[PDB]
Design a protein around this ligand. Structure first.
Ligand SMILES: [Mg+2]
Ligand SMILES: [Mg+2]
Ligand SMILES: [Mg+2]
Ligand SMILES: [Mg+2]
Ligand SMILES: [Mg+2]
Ligand SMILES: [Mg+2]
Ligand SMILES: [Mg+2]
Ligand SMILES: [Mg+2]
Ligand SMILES: [Mg+2]
Ligand SMILES: [Mg+2]
Ligand SMILES: [Mg+2]
Ligand SMILES: [Mg+2]
Ligand SMILES: [Mg+2]
Ligand SMILES: [Mg+2]
Ligand SMILES: [Mg+2]
Ligand SMILES: [Mg+2]
Ligand SMILES: [Mg+2]
Ligand SMILES: [Mg+2]
Ligand SMILES: [Mg+2]
Ligand SMILES: [Mg+2]
Ligand SMILES: [Mg+2]
Ligand SMILES: [Mg+2]
Ligand SMILES: [Mg+2]
Ligand SMILES: [Mg+2]
Ligand SMILES: [Mg+2]
Ligand SMILES: [Mg+2]
Ligand SMILES: [Mg+2]
Ligand SMILES: [Mg+2]
Ligand SMILES: [Mg+2]
Ligand SMILES: [Mg+2]
Ligand SMILES: [Mg+2]
Ligand SMILES: [Mg+2]
Ligand SMILES: [Mg+2]
Ligand SMILES: [Mg+2]
Ligand SMILES: [Mg+2]
Ligand SMILES: [Mg+2]
Ligand SMILES: [Mg+2]
Ligand SMILES: [Mg+2]
Ligand SMILES: [Mg+2]
Ligand SMILES: [Mg+2]
Ligand SMILES: [Mg+2]
Ligand SMILES: [Zn+2]
Lengths: 159, 205, 104
RNA sequence: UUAAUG
RNA sequence: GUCUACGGCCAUACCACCCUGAACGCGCCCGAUCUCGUCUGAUCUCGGAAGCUAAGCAGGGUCGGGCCUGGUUAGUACUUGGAUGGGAGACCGCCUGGGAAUACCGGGUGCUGUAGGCUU
RNA sequence: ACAGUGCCAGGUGGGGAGUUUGACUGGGGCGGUACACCUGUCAAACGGUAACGCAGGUGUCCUAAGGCGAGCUCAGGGAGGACAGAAACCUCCCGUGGAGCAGAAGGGCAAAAGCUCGCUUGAUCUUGAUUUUCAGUACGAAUACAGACCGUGAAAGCGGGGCCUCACGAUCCUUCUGACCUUUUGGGUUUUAAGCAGGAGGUGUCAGAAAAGUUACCACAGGGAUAACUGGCUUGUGGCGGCCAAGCGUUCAUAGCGACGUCGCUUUUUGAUCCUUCGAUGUCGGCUCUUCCUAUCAUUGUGAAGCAGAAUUCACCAAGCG
RNA sequence: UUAAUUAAAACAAAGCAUCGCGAAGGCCCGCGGCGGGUGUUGACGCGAUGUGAUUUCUGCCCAGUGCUCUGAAUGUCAAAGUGAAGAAAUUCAAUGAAGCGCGGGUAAACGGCGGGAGUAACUAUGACUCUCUUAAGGUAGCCAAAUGCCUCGUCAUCUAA
RNA sequence: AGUAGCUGGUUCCCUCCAAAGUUUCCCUCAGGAUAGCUGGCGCUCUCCGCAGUUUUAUCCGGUAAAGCGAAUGAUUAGAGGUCUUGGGGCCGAAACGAUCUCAACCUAUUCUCAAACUUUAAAUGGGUAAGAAGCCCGGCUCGCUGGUGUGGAGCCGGGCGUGGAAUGCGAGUGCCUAGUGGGCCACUUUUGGUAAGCAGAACUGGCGCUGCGGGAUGAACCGAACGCCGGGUUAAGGCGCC
RNA sequence: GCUUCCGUAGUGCAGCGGCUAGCACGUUAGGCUCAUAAUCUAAAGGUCCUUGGUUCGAAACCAUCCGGGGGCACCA
RNA sequence: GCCCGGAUAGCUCAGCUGUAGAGCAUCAGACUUAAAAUCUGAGGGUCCAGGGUUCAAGUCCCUGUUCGGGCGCCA
């Protein structure tokens, strides 16, 4: 059977990328973490204190507690019958912001601007995202030259 | 002696080479991988023919040795001792195992290293003979006699390249004339326009 | 391992860091009038043989050494136990080693 | 006390 | 146009050689009384300003190496799902989407935040 | 007045009594621990993932190899310099780590996490929360905080053991420590004892019985979940047949053989597995007796010889008769 | 002698060699007794053994496990008794039997009783010589035996084989 | 009427629902406990929520492939070098003086690889978001942090409904709880083994628990799942006769 | 095959990481002897089986390799 | 765990708080023609390690580390 260690099979995962070893960048340290921000988790092997677990590498949760040099985050772990919203304490190095919340906030701000606009006008402009439709009919202009006749190539052995 | 090649004919396992973990491997029979006149230039052996496999199988080092001797004898009988250059382009690294039964049985069954074998893909060159342009059917005959030492099926293809190079024969003379290629023994040196100008002046001076 | 005989550390009754004389801890003598000892003597007294089990499968070869830290201050004189990981060789304040010397 | 051979 | 001090992203910023630096600056430089530290004022610290761009440094160049970004490799290798497809097998072909990486050939060679100068 | 008897106490005591003689296991036994943990891989790019799958490691060690702060840069290579040389000491240049961080491996680390100095004991006390193993229970390990006392640094801060992933142990009993702590029984004092809290003495079969064999004199309840014999799949091995042709055959690859290699058939051998059978399928030989196969020893008919005759080899139709 | 699968090489047997006991004893039975069997006995006896007629012998070893002897010269050693301070429960000290250790014997007690090299003037064998080790290293006899894997050992005889 | 974790048996009908041979622990491996699957009893709402699904954005990888003119471990062969050194000589007393070399070394190449190598790097996949529990305002409290009615958190009082992707479906929640804890087979990936109707894994579906048409035969294959019947039509398979 | 052990001058042995490897014999040289022996005095001689690792240092400790020697090989 | 013995020069053993002794061994002088046999002097003591009492300790006292000899066995 396999061993049940903390860092079993984490050869490539906590390893730093190529030519990205050395001193940890400091904007990652000084970037502030508010409560209730959607946060993805990516481990780092330089700072060994406050590492998450290999099941939480790649997972995304949100911050409930903030301490001096670490924050707590409620992530969703699927354990053998069900998904549990469980909380882990992660140091600053293993934490980035998720922009999936940021794109949604930009879309909410755009929808609020488009809702305040055209209210006294009366034009009904669509606010919902409509998916990629069947495209409209169009005219392919084959001006000048005729289309090039594609001939399938005969077989010839290169090796 | 040892087992027939019907056992380890096909690629069954992962590639398992001789390394720090796999130690105690006996030495393979094939060690001299080229012969003929290897102390030669690219200009004096234009023609090149390859033995290209057509099966994803495992060719043994002893079969490589037997086919090398079988090609060597016909090339010495036909083209002389210094009129050809044979090159085996399959180095056997896959260490293959043996489960010898003297009674334990299948319990604790992991093989001791039996021998070496070469992992062969479809469309991969087994042997390659470069020679003069007059000796074409002789190289076809030598590779045809060397096909019988291997299992499976492989084809004989005379290449469009100039010997053991990656450049075509109709373009090779023009590139040597415009000094883009230098004869450097068996291989060739390709000079781009990417280097410094002192190399260009050393070439054209 | 090597530990010193003088350790300045926290004190329970005082509340500050004070020095402590450090000695090793050994098991005291078993009292005949303890409750389980009286129960074992009454249970063994009579016919029946050995009633309670006798442990025999001793596996590990070393013990957890315990330091008995007595306070140096004469008014307090408080003591407590301190647990350290298992070690075979052990001594108190002997041969404080140097750096970069001739080994003969 | 030891002291064999040609 | 550019520098100094503190920085962000950490090679488009690195490395080898060559050329030019007006002004402020940055430095090289002059000494050990005091603060300080060494075998040694070489480092560190202190007190300065005779000389200098020689060097660091700044800018630029090399059919430069590296690095970054594209084409080619190539719809190639590979791969989700499918078949009463093939073949003795090995493996291969097709339907349905997705889709690389070497060699090779182009381009580029730091942007920027705060404060304070210089070219008055 | 001792043998002796009655009762205690110590020794001896399979003469006798009771009981035990672990587990996994390509049957069991022997051998190993795959029984408690850790690294790389298997593992199929979140996680999880098995075999007596592979390579290994552990029950330690450290008064520093823990915690700060400062200063240096390592391994290696080149050039040199009295003894001095492949190697003793010094200097210069290059040197992204090719050294070191105690160990097995992996990750990480350059004005450091390495080396050397200066001071210390955050390897101290106390609640709670969380991760890992997981049933979402413990133990062990760790993660952020909080309340105090502290160390270092000028300070920011760092530190409540080891740069991270392993180095360890329930109830019951015993021992030590702590509170001007509780009970010790009708009340009061003092020993003693029982409590509460924190360590320690251990169960390695590591969620933890106190445990030697033999039975061919054996027994019982079961199992084809499991061996010994037949039949199954498979064919390493045993036997048999082809392909290529370096050579043997005075001359000549193939009359007859045939290396180096390679492709197949058979269940007349041994293996491999455990599918059938343990509410029984009688275990090896020999005697007798019937039938079948050809991979043909002889006989019928034929082709080739290194077939002059004879004798003998190779191949075909061929199992009728021996 | 295994009644009902083994009539034998097994058991027994005489011969041989041991051990204990002089009776308040040796061996043994019995819940118990001033109990009982040997014993209506007394070392030419009883009880416990091993081997197995006659002839010839009975090699060496007490390292190990047994058995046995000797004992204030004595390390340990329980209960009882003695001293001790405490208010007492008490703990401490001294004294301290048998048996264990210490010191001899015993192998017709259980049992056990080697290895590697060189060496004779053709070659082998090698008497002989060197070395390591135990408590000696298997002596006299015997043997491919009922005992020998290799083994259907080698030679001769018995056979055509 | 000793015990048995071990065999054998266990007595009427219909209807409805419907499994598992798996996690962890146990002197545990023929057995239990505990989760998981199952049934029953309900309750709280409806006439917003949820999804074995896709899309739009946004993070993760280190497998397939590829690479050794990039690191590590290998590994094959020719070129050009200089004294960086040396084995044999040669003309030298000797001399980096000269000389043909042959060896290691250096520089540009070249052939073949790696489950325990990797600069790159897929397909499939795994998280998160796609709004009322959300924005925009105004003000109080704090013993926390603080050049600064600074920052953060918690309270209030209002204003915004175009239910802020596609499609589909009524949802949430609490007890009691049997049986199971021997599995097997199949496209693909893959460990050991020469291979096995062999042993052991990953995804998913079947058999077990399941009838029916076909494969002559048949626990697993293809189609397709089942109340009792009539008309029609197909799938998979076939259409000489049976 | 499994578990275990050994491998040191010429020969048989020892050896507690830090030696000049130790004892005996053999060998050679010198005395004694008429010679020989024995005896006496001197001396030579170890690839520490091989590779690697730990170590400041390895004949030993750790790993593998090549030699060698015993114990097991089982009921059916 | 309790009790009692020893650990001292290369080796075996004594040692009553005030140059550590006896024997074997080595070296150096006699003897013999010479070794060996036998005399003579000399050298060699971490008194197991540390602490305490005393003016002074190998000795007295505990604390630990090795080595026997017997007892005792509820995690
Ligand atoms: Mg395999
Ligand atoms: Mg009693
Ligand atoms: Mg100066
Ligand atoms: Mg300058
Ligand atoms: Mg300049
Ligand atoms: Mg460039
Ligand atoms: Mg008894
Ligand atoms: Mg008994
Ligand atoms: Mg068993
Ligand atoms: Mg996956
Ligand atoms: Mg520092
Ligand atoms: Mg450290
Ligand atoms: Mg604190
Ligand atoms: Mg009372
Ligand atoms: Mg028997
Ligand atoms: Mg019997
Ligand atoms: Mg079966
Ligand atoms: Mg059979
Ligand atoms: Mg065969
Ligand atoms: Mg010939
Ligand atoms: Mg099975
Ligand atoms: Mg029958
Ligand atoms: Mg025939
Ligand atoms: Mg009978
Ligand atoms: Mg009879
Ligand atoms: Mg006798
Ligand atoms: Mg005798
Ligand atoms: Mg005796
Ligand atoms: Mg004899
Ligand atoms: Mg059972
Ligand atoms: Mg991986
Ligand atoms: Mg690959
Ligand atoms: Mg069952
Ligand atoms: Mg099971
Ligand atoms: Mg299987
Ligand atoms: Mg079903
Ligand atoms: Mg069905
Ligand atoms: Mg059929
Ligand atoms: Mg289908
Ligand atoms: Mg119908
Ligand atoms: Mg039909
Ligand atoms: Zn105190």
């Amino acid at each position: 059977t396999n061993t049940k260690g903390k860092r079993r099979g984490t050869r490539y995962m906590f390893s730093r990328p190529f030519r990205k070893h050395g001193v940890v960048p400091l904007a990652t340290y000084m970037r502030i973490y508010k409560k209730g921000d959607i946060v993805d988790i990516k481990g780092m092997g330089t700072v060994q204190k406050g590492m998450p677990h290999k099941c939480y590498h790649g997972k995304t949760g949100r911050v409930y507690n903030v301490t001096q040099h670490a924050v707590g985050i409620v992530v969703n772990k699927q354990v053998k019958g069900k998904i549990l919203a469980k909380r882990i304490n992660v140091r600053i190095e293993h934490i980035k912001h998720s922009k999936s919340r940021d794109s949604f906030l930009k879309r909410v701000k755009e929808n609020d601007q488009k809702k305040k606009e055209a209210k006294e006008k009366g034009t009904w402009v669509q606010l919902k995202r409509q998916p990629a439709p069947p495209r409209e009919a169009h005219f392919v202009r084959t001006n000048g030259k005729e289309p090039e006749l594609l001939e399938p190539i005969p077989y010839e052995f290169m090796a | 002696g040892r087992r027939p090649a019907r056992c380890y004919r096909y690629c069954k396992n992962k590639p398992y080479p001789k390394s720090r973990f796999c130690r105690g491997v006996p030495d393979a029979k094939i060690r001299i991988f080229d012969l003929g006149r290897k102390k030669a230039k690219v200009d004096e052996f234009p023609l090149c023919g390859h033995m290209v496999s057509d099966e994803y199988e495992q060719l043994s080092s002893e079969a490589l040795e037997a086919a090398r001797i079988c090609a060597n004898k016909y090339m010495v009988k036909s083209c002389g001792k210094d009129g050809f250059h044979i090159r085996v382009r399959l180095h056997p690294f896959h260490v293959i195992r043996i489960n010898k039964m003297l009674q334990t049985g299948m319990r604790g069954a992991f093989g001791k290293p039996q021998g070496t074998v070469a992992r062969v893909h479809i469309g991969q060159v087994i042997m390659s003979i470069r020679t003069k342009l007059q000796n074409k059917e002789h190289v076809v005959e030598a590779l045809r006699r060397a096909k019988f030492k291997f299992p499976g099926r492989q084809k004989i293809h005379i290449s469009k390249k100039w010997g053991f190079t990656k450049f075509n024969a109709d373009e090779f003379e023009d590139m040597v004339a415009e000094k883009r290629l230098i004869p450097d023994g068996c291989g060739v040196k390709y000079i781009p326009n990417r280097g410094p100008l002192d190399k260009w002046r050393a070439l054209h001076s | 391992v090597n530990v010193p005989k003088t350790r300045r550390t926290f004190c329970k009754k005082c509340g500050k860091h004070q020095p402590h004389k450090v000695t090793q801890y050994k098991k005291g003598k078993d009292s005949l009038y303890a409750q389980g000892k009286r129960r074992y003597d009454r249970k063994q007294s009579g016919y029946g043989g050995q009633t309670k089990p006798i442990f025999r499968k001793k596996a590990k070869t070393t013990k957890k050494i315990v330091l008995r830290l007595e306070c140096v201050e004469p008014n307090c004189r408080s003591k407590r136990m301190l647990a350290i990981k298992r070690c075979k060789h052990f001594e108190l304040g002997g041969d404080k080693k140097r750096k970069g010397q001739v080994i003969q």
